[PDB]
Design a binder for this molecule. Sequence first.
Ligand SMILES: [Mn+2]
Ligand SMILES: [Mn+2]
Length: 150
Amino acid sequence: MFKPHVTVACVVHAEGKFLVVEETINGKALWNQPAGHLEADETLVEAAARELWEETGISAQPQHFIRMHQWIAPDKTPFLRFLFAIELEQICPTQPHDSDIDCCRWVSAEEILQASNLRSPLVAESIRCYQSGQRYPLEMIGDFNWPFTK
Ligand SMILES: [Mn+2]
Ligand SMILES: [Mn+2]
């Protein structure tokens, strides 16, 4: 009985730049949104907040739902990738709390779209969705009748 991978991702935007995490993946350093897998008994939004803190040490809640991408991935691993947006007034200090992440870069949209090191092609698409002006309320993919304290 098929379940797919469920991951969350955030476009974090500040002073005309986007936040990107550098992960060395076999040998080379790749760029990604702060992003990861949903875990047990966790809201998509909570997830997105957690993986942000973990991969960058920013403390922020996702502000809107941009969109969700269903994609297969080169090694056939199936994904449902939830994409979110956070605007901050100014670039804020960062500190990854995860061994996976070499560092955080704040980078221009054109730099993302032009890059040859993106972790997946969804990293660039994410910027495109962002810049289209598309956003929606969290409530779009929100939790219904939830066992646990928010
Ligand atoms: Mn992670
Ligand atoms: Mn994770």
